[PDB]
Amino acid sequence: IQPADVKAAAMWGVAAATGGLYLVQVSILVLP
Amino acid sequence: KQIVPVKSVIYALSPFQQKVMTGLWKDLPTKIHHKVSENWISATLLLGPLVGTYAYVQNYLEKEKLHHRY
Amino acid sequence: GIFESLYKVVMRRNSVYVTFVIAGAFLGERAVDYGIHKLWEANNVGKRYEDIPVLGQKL
Amino acid sequence: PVDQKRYLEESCKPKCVKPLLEYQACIKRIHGDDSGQKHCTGQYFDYWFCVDKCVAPKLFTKLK
Amino acid sequence: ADEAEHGLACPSYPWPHKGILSSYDHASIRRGHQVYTEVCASCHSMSLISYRDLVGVAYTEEEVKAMAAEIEVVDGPNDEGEMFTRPGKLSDRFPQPYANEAAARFANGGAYPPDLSLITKARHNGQNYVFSLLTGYRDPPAGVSIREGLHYNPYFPGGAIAMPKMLNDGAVEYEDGTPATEAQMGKDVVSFLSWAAEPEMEERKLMGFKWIFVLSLALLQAAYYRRLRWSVLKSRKLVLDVVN
């Protein structure tokens, strides 16, 4: 159950990071 | 705020087994006919005073301006 | 069908669905903005600031 | 530097000569009177309203 | 009477910046700013527009810097408390021709030439009214002889206006050789004034188009969503054990 839980947590983290980039588009941070 | 039961029998179908945007187009002529034949009186009582008063006002303004035109 | 294919792709876990929604929002907004910009530039030819004949002749 | 607006209004002067004729009728009446308040700006307004309505699109399609 | 009091109505001219997708004619904005500086800035003021507002709209940045360096403005106290004048920078507002309202009225016979920043939004049917006002210096009608010190202008409320006929044929020499006539000068100055009153028109129109389209698609989706959620209720059959 732990592998599934950590996989789901990582997926939600990726979604959160995508939402953060969408809200604050930062090519300044993306380039380096 | 109690609920009164009625002793019915209800059959319902899942939303994913029905056409969802076709009832709006099935009977347009009949629905337009129903709207008009049911609300023509109310339309007259709404738009009647407005149009009548507007015509009266423009008429009287025309008379007044032409009368005061030296 | 294409709908069933894309469903089996991106509609089995909600996290992927929300990421897809955000990515689609970004891409669609950019596409609409590009289309409207092309339409505006086509409709207002000649009137732009960049193409006035005396843009740099006052000096 | 001939004025496009003046030329266009002169060109469209014979389009709606009826308000102009009414205005001239008032001019003759006022000349006969020569003593009253004698303005009749209404005929002026009607005639120039017609001319302005005429010269609406032509002015800008002629302007640079 | 009442007709002259409310002024002859202004027609509906086809302005180049009218329509759900229509931009300012920026060459015409430049030309209108030229004519305003040449003839209209002697009496009227703007006081709401900085020189930097012209950058990217009708002039290039170096041109605006030179134009600002032309005029001189009073700057605050120096290390001795005295006041001094320095050439205008790229942030200063347009110069004011008169010290204050009292000086303006005294110089213009008691009538105050209004501030022109928001002139096209401070009149009913603004742009058409301004163009008609500038162009329509007509001969007064029969037997309406107005007093000395004014001029007849049918569009102005009352017929008698205080400013003289300014726009004349050949008044200015346009930079790009456009033949200067009364109508052309009026069109350019009204385009410039309408830009001054609303510098955000183009961005506003673009946002409006994009968001009306996008929200229309959203409305279709919301209607479908509502119909889908309500379709288990609207297409249901119930037996109730009653007839009449």
Place this chain on the structure above:
Amino acid sequence: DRFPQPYANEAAARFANGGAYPPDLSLITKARHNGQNYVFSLLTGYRDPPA
């Protein structure tokens, strides 16, 4: 009307007084800690510097 101002601006005051700005005296007894005693002592305590 209000009390007149001896100088047109703070820079004028500084230039007149050799770079020192004589502060506004309206709230001087509340602006300075222990304002009343401080002002009285400062006005009257113009003594000789130590060795």
Place this chain on the structure above:
Amino acid sequence: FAYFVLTGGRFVYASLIRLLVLKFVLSMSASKDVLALAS
């Protein structure tokens, strides 16, 4: 079909929400006259 219609509307809504939030925050951000006076 239902979920894809809903998805199109959903990212329309996401676009709208981002627009509104950024408008408010950037309005609370700096100003053109200040940037001009930055020298």
Place this chain on the structure above:
Amino acid sequence: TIRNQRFSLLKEPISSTLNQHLIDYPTPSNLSYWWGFGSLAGICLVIQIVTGVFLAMHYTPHVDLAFNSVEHVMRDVEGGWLLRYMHANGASMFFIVVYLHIFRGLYYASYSSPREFVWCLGVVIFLLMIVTAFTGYVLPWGQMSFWGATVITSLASAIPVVGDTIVTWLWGGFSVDNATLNRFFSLHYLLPFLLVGASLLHLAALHQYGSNNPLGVHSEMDQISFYPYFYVKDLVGWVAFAIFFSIWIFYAPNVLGHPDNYIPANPMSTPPHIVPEWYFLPIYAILRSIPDKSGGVAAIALVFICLLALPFFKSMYVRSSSFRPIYQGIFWLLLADCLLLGWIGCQPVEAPFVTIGQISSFVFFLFFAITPILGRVGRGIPNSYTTD
């Protein structure tokens, strides 16, 4: 059911009140979109509050700086024209939505028992909206702003014994100057939160006595939960409203206003046409129509007395207008009268508008005076039409 271990978060005490009153509240199954208008009015209030806060981050309540500060918001602030146009046109849409709310209530006789408290709290809410919008319109400090403030505050002198004292006290200094400007800014900032409280009380009373339906009948037989069935309907309403409001913001932002408010206030000259905003025009028309300004103020008080006196009528058994042809016609005539009354208020006092207004206001009160008669006759109906 003993709640030993927790099943659902929605039934936990943290989300239990919210659960009941938002998700699980039973609602009549046949509601049309005007209940959506009520929810839409709530959303308009929230929009006004948010845009007003962010606008007040840039507005200076001084007489020498207010107008130029607003022009600052329009020209210099990053996306400030959007904030200002949203605030102004959102006031307009707030009033449009509240008017549709009120007229649906009148049509379906939702003011009848047991929703008298709901209707009365609604009347109080309407008063608060009027005051808030007026004091807010004073803020930009233009010609229309200053002169409308002057006139509407100076008609408070009609009180018999203490009129002049109240006028001077509200003015703060014999005129409508800087003191009045600061006073009005503070009040305009404060009032929307009282408006939020009034809205919450409004909703609480309604939730006590359920909700009416297009039939006006008892409706505890077929009831469904509010979510998701009416959330999606309200969502359709919200998106349509967003399209309407976006049409107003971006393409025709100054149509719902007057051009005289773009001239800095000059208490020396007087603009030739002093009228309030379009949504105060019916009230202004009633007040202007009845002469003898003391009579005008009394007439406005009478308007609000009639509005408060609607719920407490005697028989009024049949509720909906679908089964009341006479009352249906009366309501449509009243709506036409209200529109005509609003149009009259923008016209000068020259004839025939005085006669038209003096007839229209009388017809307004006539509607408010002939509903009990219809109720009594309708109470008499059943023992006459029997088919046997």
